[PDB]
Amino acid sequence: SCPAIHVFGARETTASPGYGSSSTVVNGVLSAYPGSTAEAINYPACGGQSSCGGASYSSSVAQGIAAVASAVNSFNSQCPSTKIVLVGYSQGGEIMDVALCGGGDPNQGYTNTAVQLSSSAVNMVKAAIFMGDPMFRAGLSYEVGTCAAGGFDQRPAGFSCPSAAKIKSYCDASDPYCCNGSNAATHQGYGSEYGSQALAFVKSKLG
């Protein structure tokens, strides 16, 4: 039976199968909405390490974009009136960003610039939370955080996401991968830092 709300979570590179650091927000949504359900996007979440199956970051990202699209598109067709929440942490944010906003991922060789979610799926995505997304580029309307630069896969100047209004994407200045800072620890802390903001946004969008 379809739930009223369903969440998809995508983990960061090398995280064990499941949600990884997307868990904070996924769990926040599930606890805010009893009866809601969640699934993890089971993409490689790899950067060449054997532990995660050896796929390069480029291959991992490409497979992740397709995995997000397939999972979300198929679930939407199964459950067309279910509101969808996306949560992606670091590489998991990147794959959701491409899938939802399109634009490709040129540094990763992901050449197709189309939105990968179906029209119906885009409409039922009501909130998408990205944390530590390497495609962060300061100046987009859907971004939050102290990062005034951008990450190693940053969107170009002048980018727009058709689904901007559905997104919050978080990144701080000191992060060396979504921003151009120097302290990797910042990259790991967005659940605690921004989880309440993210949940507030989700609740505002879901009702």
UniProtKB/Swiss-Prot annotation:
Can you name a GO cellular component term?
A: extracellular region
Explain how this protein's activity depends on temperature.
Optimum temperature is 60 degrees Celsius.
**Superkingdom field:** Eukaryota
The induction comment states: Induced by xylan and repressed by glucose. Expressed at neutral pH, but not under alkaline or acidic condtions.
Q: In which pathway does it act?
A: Glycan degradation; xylan degradation
Q: Which SUPFAM superfamilies match?
A: alpha/beta-Hydrolases
Show the Gene3D superfamilies listed in the entry: alpha/beta hydrolase
User: Where are the catalytic residues?
Assistant: S90, D175, H187
Name the keywords, alphabetized.
Answer: Carbohydrate metabolism, Cellulose degradation, Cleavage on pair of basic residues, Disulfide bond, Glycoprotein, Hydrolase, Polysaccharide degradation, Secreted, Serine esterase, Signal
Matches recorded under InterPro entries = AB_hydrolase_fold (IPR029058), Cutinase/axe (IPR000675)
Q: How does activity depend on pH?
A: Optimum pH is 6.
Q: Which reaction does it catalyse?
A: Deacetylation of xylans and xylo-oligosaccharides
Quaternary state and interactors = Monomer.
Q: What is this protein called?
A: Acetylxylan esterase 2
Q: Please report the organism this UniProt entry assigns to the protein.
A: Talaromyces purpureogenus (Soft rot fungus)
UniProt lists the gene as axe-2
